[PDB]
Amino acid sequence: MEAIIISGTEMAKHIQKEIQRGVESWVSLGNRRPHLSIILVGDNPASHTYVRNKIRAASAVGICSELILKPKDVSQEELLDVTDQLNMDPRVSGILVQLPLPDHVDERTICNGIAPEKDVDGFHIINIGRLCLDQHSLIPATASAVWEIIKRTGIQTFGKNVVVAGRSKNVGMPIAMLLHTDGEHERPGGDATVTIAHRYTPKEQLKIHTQLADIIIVAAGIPKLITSDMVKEGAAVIDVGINYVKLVGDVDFEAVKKKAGFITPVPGGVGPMTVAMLLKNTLLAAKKIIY
Numbered sequence: 001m002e003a004i005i006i007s008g009t010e011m012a013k014h015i016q017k018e019i020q021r022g023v024e025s026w027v028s029l030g031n032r033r034p035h036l037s038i039i040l041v042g043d044n045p046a047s048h049t050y051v052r053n054k055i056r057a058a059s060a061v062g063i064c065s066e067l068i069l070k071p072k073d074v075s076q077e078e079l080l081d082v083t084d085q086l087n088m089d090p091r092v093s094g095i096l097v098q099l100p101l102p103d104h105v106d107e108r109t110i111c112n113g114i115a116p117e118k119d120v121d122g123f124h125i126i127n128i129g130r131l132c133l134d135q136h137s138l139i140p141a142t143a144s145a146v147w148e149i150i151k152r153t154g155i156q157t158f159g160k161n162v163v164v165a166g167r168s169k170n171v172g173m174p175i176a177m178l179l180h181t182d183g184e185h186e187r188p189g190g191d192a193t194v195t196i197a198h199r200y201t202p203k204e205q206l207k208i209h210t211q212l213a214d215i216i217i218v219a220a221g222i223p224k225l226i227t228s229d230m231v232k233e234g235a236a237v238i239d240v241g242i243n244y245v246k247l248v249g250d251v252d253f254e255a256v257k258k259k260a261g262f263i264t265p266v267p268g269g270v271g272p273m274t275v276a277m278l279l280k281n282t283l284l285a286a287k288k289i290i291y
């Protein structure tokens with residue numbers, strides 16, 4: 001069947017309008033306009049592209065931003081000095097450290113250096129802890145994005161088989177967490193039956209599991225990891241992969257769009273929604289209502 005191709009770009013646009021209305025409403029009440037401080041380390045052109053999209057989108061919804069550049073050979077200590085300063089600046093509502101960081105910087109240490117209340121990526125251990133206990137939290141943007149695409153398309157999760165191909169602590173694990181957890185908890189989940197796959201799932205076992213799946217979510221960085229033979233007729237296929245090989249996903253799109261009932265393209269799928277959900281988090285953080 002010809003898959004319905006989900007426009008992340010368009011959905012992100014609708015959602016940015018909602019956040020824009022949200023920001024004006026917050027400022028209409030006597031409150032400070034959200035300010036997002038972004039730290040970009042080094043010269044990765046993809047990292048530079050994503051931060052520009054984030055600043056441009058922030059501007060569009062009336063969220064102030066400032067870009068703090070650091071060179072690739074910056075120290076862990078120097079990064080934590082900046083995060084400390086930003087934590088103490090009451091005009092900064094949100095702090096984002098673009099990943100990945102240089103190999104000599106411990107990611108987990110920097111993530112934990114951001115005040116939870118300002119942690120718009122939700123990578124701080126307290127925010128991860130609260131996510132894993134289904135409490136109100138700043139929910140990681142890409143994970144939020146996937147959940148939002150699913151809900152606004154009307155893809156049913158409740159009682160459904162879902163495979164998450166990816167266990168990363170920033171993307172994979174949060175997706176598994178949102179999708180499988182109780183619909184009635186403080187932070188509702190999808191009530192889906194979730195299989196977690198990763199680099200040590202034999203491909204033959206991954207296929208056996210995807211074949212039974214009502215939803216495949218792949219966040220692997222392996223072009224054509226998901227081939228049409230792996231997909232159940234009518235299934236939803238959410239492609240979080242970004243592969244510069246030409247930009248392609250983890251899904252064999254031209255084949256899988258003939259088998260699936262719903263597919264996200266790359267580019268134009270999860271990417272723009274990552275940006276949108278970060279801005280939602282930036283507004284939410286500014287209102288200081290979780291902590």
Ligand SMILES: Nc1nc(N)c(NC(=O)Nc2ccc(C(=O)N[C@@H](CCC(=O)O)C(=O)O)cc2)c(=O)[nH]1
Binds near residue numbers: 049053141
């Ligand atoms: N701290 C932190 N680091 C991170 N690395 C991420 N992820 C993180 O920025 N992802 C991301 C991926 C793609 C796009 C994007 O704009 N994608 C478009 C355009 C792609 C392109 O021009 O190359 C698309 O898929 O259509 C934006 C953000 C994050 O959310 N927080």
Ligand SMILES: Nc1ncnc2c1ncn2[C@@H]1O[C@H](COP(=O)(O)OP(=O)(O)O)[C@@H](O)[C@H]1OP(=O)(O)O
Binds near residue numbers: 167197200206219221
């Ligand atoms: N063949 C495969 N099948 C399913 N998932 C795979 C996969 N190969 C990689 N992945 C997963 O896709 C994800 C890639 O995410 P990532 O690049 O952000 O990695 P990291 O967690 O090290 O930062 C990983 O969770 C990865 O599994 P590992 O934790 O074992 O590295």
